[model samples]
Target: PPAQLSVHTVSWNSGHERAPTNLEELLGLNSGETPDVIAVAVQGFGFQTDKPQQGPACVKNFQSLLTSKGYTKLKNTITETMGLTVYCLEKHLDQNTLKNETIIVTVDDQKKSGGIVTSFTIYNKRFSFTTSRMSDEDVTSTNTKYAYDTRLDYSKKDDPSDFLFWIGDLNVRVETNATHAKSLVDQNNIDGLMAFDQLKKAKEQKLFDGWTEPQVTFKPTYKFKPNTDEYDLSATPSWTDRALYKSGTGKTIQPLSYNSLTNYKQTEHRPVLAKFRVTL
Candidate 1:
């Protein structure tokens, strides 16, 4: 039987904030059917230096919530700026074929800018998830660091994976001034705002070549005031947080939905969630 895997991937730049009481909406569990696989990625994940045994305050609730839902945590890795956690339904997993692999690429001595790649196999299909970012200067510089380096992208790794996803704060912004961007947002003219998106420029420069994002029907996911619906306006509201996908093995990967979770107003950036179905 040809199998299909439904995946839900979410990413947020927590701004060093704590985890929420419940993640039902964040994980897309409230939408009816449960996804077969889930990947959670966080940038600037909160760490409580005062409580060493408490683990990451931003991720503690995730473990408890997913564990109770019949999902097994396949891998959870965190560094200063990158955090990636993956889980799968136990019933659909075959332990013998499952293989875990990870790679980290740092752009600075502080390890604050870079990407993380975590990959594994399920039902004979390979899936790779990447949480990545770069400084604004780097994205705009003449020689953007790692722009041409295949090492920064997981799908290009030695053993190419069938499904590849890159999700995170990404740090790309709207290249326009805040005032004009706000006017466009107020008018619900997403296309006008997207015209100046840095990611689009990056793609034009061949930085993330061959990667495609689902049609963005929602407002920009960033530059909001903490815990509020209002835009900060200090910086242009932009879709800084993003989810991108690629099918390396010529498999069919279709995006079911791509949206920003407005319910999480705890940080300046709203979380982005994307659901995909891959046919094998």
Candidate 2:
């Protein structure tokens, strides 16, 4: 038989044992085969279900690879913002901002026994930009704090030439009003953007929100369903899913594709996929 490859986002409630089993089935593996890569959300109590199994009988060797690569640092900065753990590997690229590099990040830590690790890869190709997430709330406090922390981290990293891309569900809805039916009279009323402005001020830099493709793409990622009729489509979904990047770098980013798979019956939100390339 030939080997099979599968790409999917598991339903959030499948739990640890059941999730791996479902993944195995999706990959066409008998019982213990592992995937080439797995992306997961690393917050809340049930994120543990996203982890793969271990032992002599297991199919993958991820843990061993982590140990050998010296990526053992327990970084929880993402958890502070999104309530999840973050496992990241920042490898060396070229000395310039336009140089190519690979970032492998897991949003949650399995070894810690909580959180989910959503994984993804970014490459320098035909375009270049920075990305980040923002939530809908009082930007005065939360956004200011975030700005302070971001400045501190950037100073610590001390890599001014490298462009930054931040992506995630920032918990703030930018396109809709607080009541879900009204529209904000001023674009600045979008608290997430407000926060972004503060952060930009702190870094003395500007960022762009790469979500101009479609309005439906900003649908709600969370909800409650009491029977089928009680569904609340009127409730404004937060424009929390976002991507930010720097400007005037001779790099133009095109929104190649975007998706939010809500067909799964078990979870309210689905995985969002965006494909774009960078130009050298």
Candidate 3:
């Protein structure tokens, strides 16, 4: 029999929204079938001084939700702008062989912005999870602006985690007008609208290279009116929260689904969940 593992990664920009008590939908624990690992990435605003402090209150909630579900926290890392946490089934971890590190890169107007990558080995198969947030500014080759891309330094040659799940609010959005974006959402032409995704544009500029994201058939996951399905329209609705995957050392990553959890209406941004199976 072949070895396989399931991973669920969720990314959200809280917009300084406080953590909620109910995580059944956010964690996918009560969604009938639970995954082998859970990764959480968050980007928040409020106390603009430091960013890593934004996720722990949410972490406390996650710990309570996961510990009772037969899982152990593998790693927890945070930056002033982003946070990452990895929870794995306790049944799989044998000894202390986890290596986790945080990479902090100062870019644009954001003081400290970055991601966390945590790795562990089971049956000689290494798994890694990374959650990151990019700068809030929009910089490109056509423009003279500057923004940092921290993901370019994360390499399979370095840590080489066989299965890598990188999920977060990458700050990428649709490069379109508000009227056109609203029209596409109304017509349910997600693919058509995605053609203007800045992330895709960044890939061409060699930022997030070799990384893959599951097809998005849902509407934009950002800039909403909190409790309603209405887009603010002050800015174009775009897929700001994202989930990405990379296979290190020829490992296989099969994405089952990638979409946003629209029920979490705490802030202007919605939460995104990605479920996948990895051939380990």
Candidate 4:
């Protein structure tokens, strides 16, 4: 038998938009084989201005939906503008101990500028998931390391995690001009577009050392017009919503698929999904 676990991770910057009524596609439930674990991260989740209790209601909604599918909610951490939730198949939790479940928040003078880090251990394997918001103005200038620095330190703390995954609105943009980016996107030239990706520059600076992003075949997930396939052209087309993974315990984390769910068209940025099978 293969000592492996399949994981589904999705990130969405709703821009204060509502989630879809049916999350089957977003959760990858439509893919036939159910994953053993699921992690969801959201930025700018809809919250009433006068309501702080909205967080509980939102998580309860997710819990209700996933509970019916035989999944047990492992953790739900939310700040003013960010949310990270994790779930595991009910069968897998009976024999394993979930340990060191922690939520580390990065704050800038008590404002909602940073992100969330949720980590846990199960079946003796440590996993960390992070969702961060960065400065759009710092996209191409300066080494602004808010989320990356915190996440790296936390995952490397107290024996280190077996696997580390960074997901959500990384806010890394395409450095290319809008016209040129739009031209490449029109031709489905992902490679050409990737050449100017801000994340590529970050890697050159060693900001995202050893992190691997699955080969992306999908179009840019940002600056899309709501309820349409058209690019708004306000900002350059960029793969801002992203997923990156790393392994620290001499294990292999294989990415099965990486794509943006085009059906979700309510927000300016589309949601991104990645599926992985990890060797234990």
Candidate 5:
């Protein structure tokens, strides 16, 4: 049998003004080694106000090497901007480590910015699923539903021993708002019950929050006003950037590490990254 595999996902939001420096600092790129894979958010760049030109520069070095070596770009610019990039490494140890592994990565392309969500899978690979969010209409007070819950159910059902890792910037709020709270109170619905109920269902399906470990990594990713002296922290409200796996799994899925890289003095929200591993 092959050795257990590990994978890392770098949130390379390359469109920010400080992307080049941030990438170098985070990935530890010396003279020539870049990361094995980079999950980029295509919707992160803003023209004048948002530093849209930053991504091209940040990825210039890596892209230059690829261009020189004649490597084919796997991601489709028109369809999907966020996914996996496989590279062949010469190091014997690194090559032996990732003999049979797959990394499922996500990017927020709807906004054209580079916000990535990533996960890894190893042995017993018999399952696959996509990340989704609830539609605005289905996001009512009574019921919160995902775009494709049935597909997720089917994936798990089809493969009991399979490792299913799903990660993405799911646009769902775990907390309830004033309007929702009022609706629940008026109708005698359990206080904060809607969100709780949704979470309960998720738990029943064996979904786990990868960031539940001891750390102050849960800062809000939104609510920052750029060019403000008082704008501190990354942002106010954090959307769901998560990792999930199936039940009774033979593989171990661990959230290895994460960090927030921000130019907070100038911008409101900073980019974040999550790394994980898959062990058999």
Candidate 6:
């Protein structure tokens, strides 16, 4: 046997928009062979500070899509502006202990940031899924370590999951000219575009210190015109949504694929997806 697990992760910022009818492709149901697990992260769907945000219809649609394939919705968490869902094949659940938790971080003194961490132990091997969100202003945020440190601490408190995946509208951007960014994307020069990625800068500054993302071969997943596959040009096209992974001490995770789904043009941002194969 391979002694490995396959994982597929995706993220979207819906701009409070409606979901399209095709759930199969949106969920990567036909991306290839059925993956062992699928996790989803979403943002900008009817956020409100005073009440619990019910994830948009897409969450349920995803549930229905995976459930039909004999996968179980392992855990779900929804904040005012974001949601995280984890699904695993029924075969895997019977052998693992699953623990799900959520945390809300009040940024700028408001309930605007948070994340969900789900962990499962299968045959003594552990795996985790996490997703989070914050308001737009966080893009300029500095000295905002508390929100990250606290949430990270909680996510790791329960004996770190051997393989950890973090995804969401990370609020990272490009601090450069919009024209230059588009020119790079137009030229398919992703290396040139990455030179200005805020997430890389933030990571260099010790933010999310231990996390790692697969090499990016795609353009930014943000600021597109709703329902069109065109950049809005109001901001530099940047990879706002992402999938990052980390492993417990001495553990390893390998990324098999990373790309954005262009067909999901219903919102101002396209969805980003990553697939991984991990050795327990």
lDDT of 1 by residue, 1-280 (tens): 3478899999988766766776889989986768888999887643423234335554577777777788988888877666788898878777788887888876667666677788888878889888876665564233663323367576666668899988887667788999999999999999989999887777777777889989998999888888799999888899977888998889899999999999989989999999999998
Which candidate number has the best lDDT?
Answer: 1
Clashing pairs in 6: none
Over the stretch 218-252, how does candidate 2's per-residue lDDT look in tens digits? 34344424223222455543333433333234344
The CA lDDT of each predicted structure is: 0.80, 0.30, 0.73, 0.78, 0.38, 0.73
| Best of the candidates, TM-score | 1
| lDDT tens readout by residue for model 4, 111-140 | 465666777777778788877776543332
Residues forming the 10-long window of minimal summed lDDT in candidate 3: 140-149
Please write out the lDDT profile of model 6 over residues 10-108, one tens digit for every residue. 888876665567866766767556888888877765554423333456567666667778898877766667767788888876432554444444444
List ranges where model 2 is wrong by over 4 Å. Answer: 1-42, 46-149, 152-163, 174-218, 224-235
Error of 6 at 41 (Å): 0.4
**Tens digit per residue, CA lDDT, model 5, 1-280:** 3444333333322224454433444432323544333333322234333334444653576566544543333331211233233322222122233333333222233533222222223232433323333333543222434323433332344444343444444334335444454454446454333343234454454443321321224434343465543333332243334434443445565666665544433454444555545455
Model 6 RMSD to the real structure?
Answer: 3.2
Q: Which stretches of candidate 3 lie over 4 Å from their true place?
A: 46-60, 100-103, 107-110, 138-153, 156-159
Better of 3 and 4 by TM-score: 4
Q: Estimate each model's TM-score.
A: 0.91, 0.42, 0.87, 0.90, 0.50, 0.87
Error of 4 at 178 (Å): 0.5
